Each structure stands twice: as C-alpha cells, then as structure tokens.
C-alpha cells in the first residue's frame, strides 16, 4: 500500500479534474459552435 | 469520514452521476442529430 | 452494498463497464463514414 | 496486497488510462470534422 495504492488515488484525482475541465468545454462546445 | 480522503470518494460521487446523465444525453443525441 | 462506501465502489463499478461498452460503439460510428 | 476489492482497483487503472488515451484520440474528431 502507498507505494502502489495512494499513488492510484491521487494519480485519479488528477485526471478527474482533467477531464472534469474537458467536459464543460467539449459538452458546452457542442451547444456553440 | 476522514477528510483529504473522504473529499474523493464524495467528488467521485458527484462527477459519477453528473456523467451518467451527461452520457445519456450527449450518447442518445448522437443517435438522432 | 454497505455504507456509502462499498455502495459506492459498486455503483461506479456498473458504470465503468456501461461507459466501455458505450465507447467501443459510439467510437466506432465515428469511424463508420 | 489484498484480494477481493484488489482486482477493483486494478480495473479502474486500466479505465484511467484508457480515457486518457482515447481522450487525446477521439478528441482530434472535434478539431478535424
């Protein structure tokens, strides 16, 4: 654990936040052009 | 109920259902547009 | 289907398989023209 | 390392690459029509 497990749970936390940014532009993109 | 922890499984939750509703629109869209 | 905790773990589990298969056909109608 | 919910973790790594990686993929569609 920690070495490979918390890596796992902050490694996602990034790529929520990621793909949390990349939603609203794709998906509000959609509804703009 | 801990807390730089509990705020991921709470955000996943969040972000978990805000896609699944967000996929059923944008997907059922995608076959009819 | 414990506390909000394996409850949870399970209900994000549901969907990571739904948003695999809805990729591999969705992504595919991209490739189809 | 544990066993039941280990494999749980696992998969979701799998996932979180595989979003990345597609994400970057898929999203070119969006700039290219």
Redo the contacts between chains.
Sequence with gaps: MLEP?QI??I???I??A???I??TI??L??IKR
């Design positions: 497990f796992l749970s490694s996602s936390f790529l929520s990621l793909h949390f990349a939603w794709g998906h993109n959609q």
